[PDB]
Amino acid sequence: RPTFYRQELNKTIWEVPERYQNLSPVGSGAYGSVCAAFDTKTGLRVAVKKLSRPFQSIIHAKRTYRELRLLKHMKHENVIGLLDVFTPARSLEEFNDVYLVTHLMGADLNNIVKCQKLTDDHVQFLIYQILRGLKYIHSADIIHRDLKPSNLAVNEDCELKILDFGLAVATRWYRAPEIMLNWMHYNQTVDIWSVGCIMAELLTGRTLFPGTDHIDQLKLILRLVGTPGAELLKKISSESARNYIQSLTQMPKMNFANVFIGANPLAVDLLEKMLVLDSDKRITAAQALAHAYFAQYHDPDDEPVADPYDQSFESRDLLIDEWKSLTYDEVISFVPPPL
Numbered sequence: 001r002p003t004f005y006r007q008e009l010n011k012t013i014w015e016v017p018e019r020y021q022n023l024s025p026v027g028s029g030a031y032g033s034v035c036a037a038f039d040t041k042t043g044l045r046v047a048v049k050k051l052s053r054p055f056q057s058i059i060h061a062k063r064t065y066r067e068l069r070l071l072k073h074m075k076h077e078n079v080i081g082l083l084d085v086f087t088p089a090r091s092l093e094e095f096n097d098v099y100l101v102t103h104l105m106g107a108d109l110n111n112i113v114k115c116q117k118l119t120d121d122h123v124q125f126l127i128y129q130i131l132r133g134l135k136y137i138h139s140a141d142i143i144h145r146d147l148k149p150s151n152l153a154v155n156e157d158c159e160l161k162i163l164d165f166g167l168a169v170a171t172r173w174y175r176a177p178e179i180m181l182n183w184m185h186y187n188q189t190v191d192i193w194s195v196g197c198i199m200a201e202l203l204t205g206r207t208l209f210p211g212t213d214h215i216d217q218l219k220l221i222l223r224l225v226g227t228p229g230a231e232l233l234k235k236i237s238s239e240s241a242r243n244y245i246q247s248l249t250q251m252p253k254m255n256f257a258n259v260f261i262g263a264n265p266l267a268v269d270l271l272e273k274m275l276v277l278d279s280d281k282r283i284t285a286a287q288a289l290a291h292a293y294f295a296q297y298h299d300p301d302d303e304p305v306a307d308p309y310d311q312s313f314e315s316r317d318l319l320i321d322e323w324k325s326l327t328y329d330e331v332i333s334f335v336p337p338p339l
């Protein structure tokens with residue numbers, strides 16, 4: 001067991017191993033707080049996240065377990081992974097805090113773009129990387145569900161990593177129309193919709209669908225891609241949703257070539273394949289990587305898939321101490337990567 005030291009940064013108490021030095025606050029969210037630090041063992045700048053109230057309830061306890069299990073499984077260049085996970089506790093009985101450590105990333109895509117058009121080479125490279133990560137995540141039967149610029153970490157070398165996947169600027173702006181409609185059987189291509197929205201924004205410098213609420217969001221979407229055709233209407237079970245949808249003034253799909261005129265025609269073609277209303281007809285991450293737009297980056301021998309990921313715990317109804325003990329087990333069993 002390493003030697004820990006304690007300090008207060010903002011209102012939060014940080015108790016970490018002495019290997020981590022020079023902690024300085026970087027951000028805060030509902031799920032936890034983050035500090036930048038220097039890892040003396042590796043010479044790397046790292047980000048350290050202290051989870052907030054991880055075992056306050058069964059809900060929080062299961063979430064904490066879900067997050068740790070997911071992060072321990074993600075091992076890919078374009079997905080955030082773990083360098084370390086620790087707790088100051090020396091036994092299960094005093095286990096109350098969980099800290100996660102990863103490579104410090106400089107900014108998010110939102111901050112990077114702020115707020116102009118990127119060059120076509122940068123769009124190619126950033127989107128390629130999102131898709132490469134997404135192929136990996138999807139191969140493990142994981143749906144991200146909340147892909148947006150603020151969940152994409154990017155360094156000054158344009159290296160990109162997907163953050164907080166499978167843990168489920170307004171989020172609704174990047175959400176698939178079937179999610180606005182509350183379809184309970186949406187699939188992994190909801191993530192491809194989000195990528196299409198991100199890509200459009202990198203090309204134009206403007207949010208593609210800046211909806212003010214869920215109904216407005218769906219309206220803006222249909223304005224561009226058109227109201228649903230016959231084949232898609234057949235797939236909608238809900239009578240109320242069909243009545244609503246069929247009662248909108250019908251609109252044809254816009255010509256993407258004109259909407260995004262000036263962009264690389266290959267980028268336009270790919271956007272057309274990503275922003276398809278019927279999710280069953282959207283391009284997959286694997287297919288997208290093979291699209292001619294990424295000719296300069298695609299290497300089928302270096303776009304790996306993930307090891308199988310067991311999410312059976314999601315259907316379990318356990319006690320708060322049981323989720324806590326499983327989490328403790330996952331902390332103790334952690335093996336750091338080669339480095």
Ligand SMILES: CN(C)c1cc(-c2ccncc2)c(-c2cccc3ccccc23)nn1
Pocket residue numbers: 029034035047048049071080081082100101102103104105106150151153163164
């Ligand atoms: C913007 N969000 C939601 C972030 C951003 C970061 C982050 C990551 C790397 N560099 C800077 C900030 C982390 C985060 C921060 C610290 C450790 C983490 C460990 C695993 C996963 C995420 C971690 N968590 N959430």
Ligand SMILES: Fc1ccc(-c2n[nH]cc2-c2ccncc2)cc1
Pocket residue numbers: 180181182214215216218238240241244
């Ligand atoms: F964005 C959305 C989300 C949900 C709906 C919807 N599903 N079933 C019924 C409705 C609906 C919503 C508003 N007005 C009439 C009907 C309509 C639009």
Ligand SMILES: Fc1ccc(-c2n[nH]cc2-c2ccncc2)cc1
Pocket residue numbers: 177178181183228232235236237245277278279280
């Ligand atoms: F207006 C719309 C917008 C999107 C959808 C949609 N696209 N892919 C799947 C669906 C869908 C939505 C509701 N129920 C089944 C399927 C259906 C109607």
